[PDB]
Amino acid sequence: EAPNQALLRILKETEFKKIKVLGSGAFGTVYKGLWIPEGEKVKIPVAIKELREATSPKANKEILDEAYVMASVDNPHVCRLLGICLTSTVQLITQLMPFGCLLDYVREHKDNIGSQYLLNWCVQIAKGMNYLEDRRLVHRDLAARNVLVKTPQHVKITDFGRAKLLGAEEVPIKWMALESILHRIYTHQSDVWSYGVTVWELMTFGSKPYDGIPASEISSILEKGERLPQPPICTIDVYMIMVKCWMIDADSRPKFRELIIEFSKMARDPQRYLVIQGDERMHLPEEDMDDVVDADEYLIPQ
Ligand SMILES: CC(C)n1c(Nc2ccccc2)nc2cnc(Nc3ccc(N4CCN(C)CC4)cc3)nc21
Ligand SMILES: [Cl-]
Numbered sequence: 001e002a003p004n005q006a007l008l009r010i011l012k013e014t015e016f017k018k019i020k021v022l023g024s025g026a027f028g029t030v031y032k033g034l035w036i037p038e039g040e041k042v043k044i045p046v047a048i049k050e051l052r053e054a055t056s057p058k059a060n061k062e063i064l065d066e067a068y069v070m071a072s073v074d075n076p077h078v079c080r081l082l083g084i085c086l087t088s089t090v091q092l093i094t095q096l097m098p099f100g101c102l103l104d105y106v107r108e109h110k111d112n113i114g115s116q117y118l119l120n121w122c123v124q125i126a127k128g129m130n131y132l133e134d135r136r137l138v139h140r141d142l143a144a145r146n147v148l149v150k151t152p153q154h155v156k157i158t159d160f161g162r163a164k165l166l167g168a169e170e171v172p173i174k175w176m177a178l179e180s181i182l183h184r185i186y187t188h189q190s191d192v193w194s195y196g197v198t199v200w201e202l203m204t205f206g207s208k209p210y211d212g213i214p215a216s217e218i219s220s221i222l223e224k225g226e227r228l229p230q231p232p233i234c235t236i237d238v239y240m241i242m243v244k245c246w247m248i249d250a251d252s253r254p255k256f257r258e259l260i261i262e263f264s265k266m267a268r269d270p271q272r273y274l275v276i277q278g279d280e281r282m283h284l285p286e287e288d289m290d291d292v293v294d295a296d297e298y299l300i301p302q
Contacts, residue, residue, distance in 0.1 A: 004072055006071045006072045007071075007300075007302055008067075008068075008071050008083070008084065009082065009083030009084070009300075010083060010084060010085075010086065011035070011082075011083040011084065011085045011093060012038075012085070012087075013085055013087040015035055015036060015037065015038060016033050016034060016035035016036065016046060016048070016085075016093065017033055017034055018031040018032075018033045018048060019031065019032050019033050019034065019286075020032045022047060022100075027051045027052050027054075027059055028049060028050055028051035028052060028063075029049075029050065030047050030048065030049045031047065031048040031049075031050075032045075032046075032047060032096060033045075033046050033047070033048050033093075033096075034046065035082070035093060037298075041291060042291055042292075042293040042298060043289075043291045043292050043293065044082075044095070044292075044293055044294070044295055044298055045095070045096040045098075045292065045294070045295075046082060046093050046094065046095060046096050046295070047093070047094055047095070047096045047097070048085075048091050048092070048093050049063075049091060049092045049094075050089055050090065050091040050092075051063060051089050051090070052089075053089075055088070055089050060089070060090055062161065063090050063092065063161075064090060065161070066092065066160050066161045066163075067081055067084050067090070067092050069137070069160040069163045070092065070094065070160050072135070073131070073132070073135065073137075073160075075127070075128055075131040075156075076127075076128075076154070076156070076296075077124050077125065077127045077128030077131065077155065077156050077157060078128045078131055078132065078156055078157050078158075079094055079095070079097075079148060079156045079157060079158040080094060080095070080295075081093070081094050082094050082095060082295060094295070095150075095294065095295030095296065096295075097148035097149055097150045097156070098149070098150065098151070099148075099149035099150070099151065099152065099285075100148065100149060101144070101145050101146070101147060101148055101149070102121065102144050102145075102147040102148065102149055102155055102202070103143070103144035103145045103147070103201060103206050104145075104206075105149050105152075106144070106201075106202055106205050106206045107205065107206035109284065110205040110206070112282045112283065112284055113205070113276075113282065113284070114270075114276060114279050114282040114284075115233075115270035115271055115273070115274035115275075115276055115279050116267065116270040117152060117284065118202055118203065118270075118274060119263055119266050119267040119270050119273065119274065120153070120267055121147070121155050121202060122199055122202070122259075122263040123260055123263045123264050123267055124154070124155050124156075125142075125147060125155065125157065125195065125198065125199075126195065126256050126257075126259040126260040126263060127256075127260055128156060128157040129142070129157065129191060129192075129195060129256045129259075130256040130257050130260060132157075132188075132191075133188045133191075133256055136165055136166045137160075137163055137164070137165060137166070138163065138164050138165075138166055138186050138187065138188060138190070138191050139157065139159075139160065139162070139163055139191055139194070140162040140163060140164060140186050140190075140191070141159055141161070141162040141163075141172060141175070141194075142157070142175065142191060142194040142195055142197075142198055143172060143175050143194065143197070143198055143201070144198045144201035144202060144206070146158050146159040147198065150294075150296075151285075152284040152285060164186065166187065166188065173215035173218050173219075174197065174209045174210055174215065174218060175193075175194045175197045175198070175209070176190075176193075176194065177189070177190040177192075177193035177194065177250065178193075178219070178222045178223070178248065179250060181218070181219050181222070182219065187250060188256070189250035189251065189253050190250065191256075192245050192250075192253050192254060192255075192256060192259070193245050193246055193250075193253065195245060195256070195259065196241075196242045196243075196244075196245025196246055197209055197228070197245075199241075199242055199245075200228050200231065200242055203231040203233060203234050203238070203242075203274075204231045209228060210228070227243060227246050228242070228246075233274050233275050233276050234274065234275075235272070235273045235274065235275065237266070237273050238266070238273050238274065241254070241259070241262060241263075
């Protein structure tokens with residue numbers, strides 16, 4: 001096992017300003033903000049995630065594990081941590097994704113969303129996921145809600161709070177592989193099953209999974225051999241791939257690098273694998289912004 005030499009960057013609260021609340025849930029809230037690095041003359045659009053005024057020690061121990069992971073990843077399809085702030089309670093700063101999470105995005109734009117885009121996201125997510133596998137990381141919470149849109153073309157994975165290294169002792173039931181539900185067993189392959197669900201979410205345009213069914217129920221349903229329905233826009237090819245992600249024997253399930261390859265192919269003839277009405281028709285998208293630099297553009301030594 002190699003040494004992790006990721007640099008953890010420490011930021012002063014003076015370096016950045018919160019502007020809106022992007023989302024508020026549970027313990028903590030995420031802000032849209034601007035970060036200007038010290039003496040750099042660049043402004044970077046950022047999200048800032050912080051917990052409640054309650055500063056309880058256990059919660060911090062959870063946010064710092066997350067930061068740790070996000071600090072340790074470098075892929076175009078994975079969200080990375082810019083740095084952290086220690087001023088009262090910990091905050092995580094990372095690059096902002098303007099269009100929000102993918103799940104919201106498909107629901108909002110279904111009528112302008114096309115086969116090429118859906119296939120591309122699939123390729124992209126599988127890429128981010130393959131990277132994590134390379135780094136031996138199990139996301140353990142992959143959902144459409146945890147994919148973020150920089151742009152319609154570009155998406156990245158996020159929410160590494162539940163992330164573990166593979167083979168480590170250390171709840172979203174619906175996205176969970178059966179082995180995980182029965183035995184709390186997680187492997188990259190468990191991760192793969194979740195990918196299949198995420199894909200199902202996009203093809204059904206944000207439809208809820210096993211809607212109307214209680215989670216306690218779900219283990220039984222899966223046990224019986226039940227699985228998610230084939231989406232209307234889905235060819236048998238595409239659905240066939242999803243179904244492979246949901247096999248009892250996890251070694252029979254596809255590898256993320258296979259998934260990249262198969263969806264990659266489909267993306268060269270997108271109309272053959274996804275049937276959507278008016279597919280051809282569809283197209284998709286504070287005073288001084290001169291100095292605005294995206295995080296992807298902004299780079300540091302190392
Ligand atoms: C809001 C959460 C999902 N988030 C975290 N979370 C996060 C997790 C760990 C560390 C740092 C951030 N990083 C984020 C980075 N970027 C964005 N962007 C973004 C998020 C939400 C929205 N909207 C606008 C449309 N609304 C209908 C729904 C809310 C627009 C843009 N969100 C992030
Ligand atoms: Cl759930």
